[PDB]
Design an enzyme around this catalytic site. Structure first.
Site: not given
Ligand code: 1AH
Lengths: 99, 99
Positions: B25-27
Site C-alpha cells: 500500500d503506497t497510500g
Molecule cells: C497517515 O495515515 C496512514 O498512512 N494510514 C494508512 C491508511 O489508512 N491508508 N489509506 C488511507 C489513507 C491514505 C492517505 C493518507 Br495521507 C491517510 C490515510 C487507505 C487504505 O489504502 C488502507 C486499507 C487497505 C485495505 C483495507 C482497509 C484499509 C484504504 O482505505 N483502502 C480502501 C479504499 C480507499 C478508497 C476507496 C475504496 C477503498 C477500499 C480499500 O481499498 C495505514 C492505517 C494503513 C497506516
C-alpha cells in the site's frame, strides 16, 4: 514517471477544471475525493477503510487528469483523510509497482 | 518483479517465522499487521484512515522478508482488516510506482 516512496506519493490532478493534490494509493480499490461538486446522478457506495466502512457518493464516467494522463472513470466523493487515487484509475494511466 | 493493479497487489511475506499475505500500500505510511506476537518492546499508537482510527502496538527494528527481499523496520500490530505493508518498508525493497 518513476515515483519513489520516501515521502507520500502526492500528485496534482485536474477534475472539473480544477487542480487538486491527491495520493496515488495502490492499496485503494477505488478513488475517493474530499467533499466537492460533480455533475450527473450518483449512487450509494460503502468503502472499507482501516477504521471501518463509510458512506460515499458514487459518480461514474467522470473526467480526471492525473499527472497529465487523462482518465475517465468512477469517482467517489466523501469524508476521506485526503484525495485518494485508487486502482480503478491507476490502471488507466498504466501505473504498476516495481522492485 | 512488476506488479499490475488490475487486482489488489497482495504478496507473501515472512515475519516472526510466519508466512503471511499482505497488501503493498503506497497510500500507507506504516506497516500494520493483524493480531500476532512480535519480539521485544512495544509502544501504543493510533493510526487512522478511511473509517477513523484504531489502536495498535508499535514494535521497532523488526525483520521482514517481502518477495525474497529482506528489510528492517517498524511494524504495527492491531485490528487492521488486512495486512498492509506501508511505505516505511516498501522503500527498503526498492519498490516504486511507474507509469
Ligand atoms: C497517515 O495515515 C496512514 O498512512 N494510514 C494508512 C491508511 O489508512 N491508508 N489509506 C488511507 C489513507 C491514505 C492517505 C493518507 Br495521507 C491517510 C490515510 C487507505 C487504505 O489504502 C488502507 C486499507 C487497505 C485495505 C483495507 C482497509 C484499509 C484504504 O482505505 N483502502 C480502501 C479504499 C480507499 C478508497 C476507496 C475504496 C477503498 C477500499 C480499500 O481499498 C495505514 C492505517 C494503513 C497506516
Amino acid at each position: 514517471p518513476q515515483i519513489t516512496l520516501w515521502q507520500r506519493p502526492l500528485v496534482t490532478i485536474k477534475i472539473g477544471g480544477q487542480l487538486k493534490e491527491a495520493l496515488l494509493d495502490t492499496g485503494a480499490d477505488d478513488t475517493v475525493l474530499e467533499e466537492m461538486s460533480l455533475p450527473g446522478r450518483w449512487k450509494p457506495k460503502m468503502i472499507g477503510g482501516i477504521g471501518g466502512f463509510i458512506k460515499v457518493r458514487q459518480y461514474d464516467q467522470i473526467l480526471i487528469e492525473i499527472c497529465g494522463h487523462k482518465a475517465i472513470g468512477t469517482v467517489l466523493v466523501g469524508p476521506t483523510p485526503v484525495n485518494i487515487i485508487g486502482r480503478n484509475l491507476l490502471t488507466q494511466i498504466g501505473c504498476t509497482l516495481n522492485f
